[PDB]
Amino acid sequence: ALDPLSETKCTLKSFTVEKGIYQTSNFRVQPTESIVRFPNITNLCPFG
Amino acid sequence: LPVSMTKTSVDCTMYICGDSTECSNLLLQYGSFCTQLNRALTGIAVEQ
Numbered sequence A: 001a002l003d004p005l006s007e008t009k010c011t012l013k014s015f016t017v018e019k020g021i022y023q024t025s026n027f028r029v030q031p032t033e034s035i036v037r038f039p040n041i042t043n044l045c046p047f048g
Numbered sequence B: 001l002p003v004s005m006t007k008t009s010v011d012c013t014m015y016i017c018g019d020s021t022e023c024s025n026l027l028l029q030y031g032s033f034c035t036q037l038n039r040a041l042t043g044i045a046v047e048q
């Protein structure tokens, strides 16, 4: 969990990594609004 | 003649568990499958 060069070593299970490219980590994108929501009214009930 | 198919890649732990820490925890018992499963695709990927 230190940093990407380290997390690479967490994959190949080697303290030495050959030069190249390595699919390393489970990247993700996040939501930032826990929105609770609804629609657009018109016709109310007359208890009058 | 064809030359190469689309370089598909999947991450098991996402595909197997769409971010459910309970799910991944059980999977880890299965060991190196979803390392090697990932690996072969990359082997497929690079070979393209």
Ligand SMILES: *[C@@H]1O[C@H](CO)[C@@H](O[C@@H]2O[C@H](CO)[C@@H](O)[C@H](O)[C@H]2NC(C)=O)[C@H](O)[C@H]1NC(C)=O
Pocket: A040, A041
């Ligand atoms: C949905 O509710 C809105 C009130 O929030 C109604 O009021 C407006 O109606 C006018 C004319 O149609 C629109 O130009 C406005 O945009 C509506 N609201 C606002 C402030 O934008 C609206 O009529 C209702 N539904 C409909 C049929 O639009």
